[PDB]
């Protein structure tokens, strides 16, 4: 269960709809943050529960953020930010054997796809029921951040 | 070392004018991307030229693009794209221990910037200097960036 957190000043979502002749246009936005974090969540092929939680409990409570003399002491609640959890299966694309990426260890569509909902439903539970923005799983999307710091962060719940 | 790859479609690197001639405060632009790689790079203390030697290739050869009824088809150097590497020490913030991050793990401010100097140049030699840009090395950067897709892959030259 692997993820990319980028701490951010901003972030904006959109994807396309349909009906567009020119050379990809047509973009639609359905989907912001301000001051924040924003996430890529890949789900593996035998993820379980305890490992959807470990991405929220981080994503939730790492102190990111320097206040006032001390650095590294704020979390996103503390600040009250908001969060953009976004599915991502590229991080499972195995590229060990070649210039073509091998996605086979990721977790198959419909399978990942309710998973995903689930966690993007827990990740309120633990926070504040509006802090939280999705993408739209299966879509091409766009995505202008605002990249503070910069400051990125990687976890595989696996290595532990 | 780690790197994290993102595709975009542009990407705008900014710094703070630490300006106390003439004014105060203000960020101003010093690098500048289209379409193309973003690339958060992390020194590690134990990395060998190998290492780097192989994110410069992963990194300029994958294919992460979509040619002609083609998926996976097209790697930065084909259709002529750029990158724009950015050193990133927190990508070693170790994570299990407590909520604040150490990186206790990640190689040192100026043993690192030269190593990074190292990449960067052979970046601009395995491909072309002009596609290939950077930032400010240790400093407060605004990085807007235009993820196209999103498509993020991770290598972990450790594995």
């Given at each position: 269960m692997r993820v990319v957190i980028q701490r951010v000043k901003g972030a904006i979502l959109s994807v396309r709809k349909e009906?567009?002749?020119?050379?990809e246009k047509e973009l639609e936005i359905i989907s912001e943050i301000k001051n924040g974090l924003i996430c890529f969540l890949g789900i593996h092929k035998n993820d379980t529960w305890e490992d959807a939680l470990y991405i929220i409990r981080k994503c939730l409570n790492?102190?990111?953020?320097?206040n006032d003399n001390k650095t590294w002491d704020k979390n996103v609640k503390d600040?009250?930010?908001?969060?953009?959890?976004?599915?991502?299966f590229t991080l499972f694309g195995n590229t060990k054997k070649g210039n073509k990426p091998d996605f086979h260890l990721a977790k198959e569509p419909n399978e990942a796809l309710?998973?995903?909902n689930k966690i993007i439903d827990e990740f309120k539970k633990q926070?504040?029921?509006?802090?939280?923005?999705?993408?739209?799983?299966?879509?091409?999307?766009?995505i202008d951040?605002?990249?503070?710091?910069?400051?990125?962060?990687?976890?595989?719940?696996?290595?532990?």
């Amino acid at each position: 269960m692997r993820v990319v957190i980028q701490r951010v000043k901003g972030a904006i979502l959109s994807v396309r709809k349909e009906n567009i002749g020119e050379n990809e246009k047509e973009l639609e936005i359905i989907s912001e943050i301000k001051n924040g974090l924003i996430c890529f969540l890949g789900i593996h092929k035998n993820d379980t529960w305890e490992d959807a939680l470990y991405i929220i409990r981080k994503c939730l409570n790492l102190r990111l953020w320097n206040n006032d003399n001390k650095t590294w002491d704020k979390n996103v609640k503390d600040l009250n930010y908001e969060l953009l959890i976004v599915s991502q299966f590229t991080l499972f694309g195995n590229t060990k054997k070649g210039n073509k990426p091998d996605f086979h260890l990721a977790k198959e569509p419909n399978e990942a796809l309710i998973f995903y909902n689930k966690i993007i439903d827990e990740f309120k539970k633990q926070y504040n029921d509006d802090k939280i923005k999705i993408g739209k799983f299966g879509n091409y999307m766009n995505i202008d951040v605002t990249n503070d710091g910069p400051v990125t962060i990687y976890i595989d719940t696996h290595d532990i």
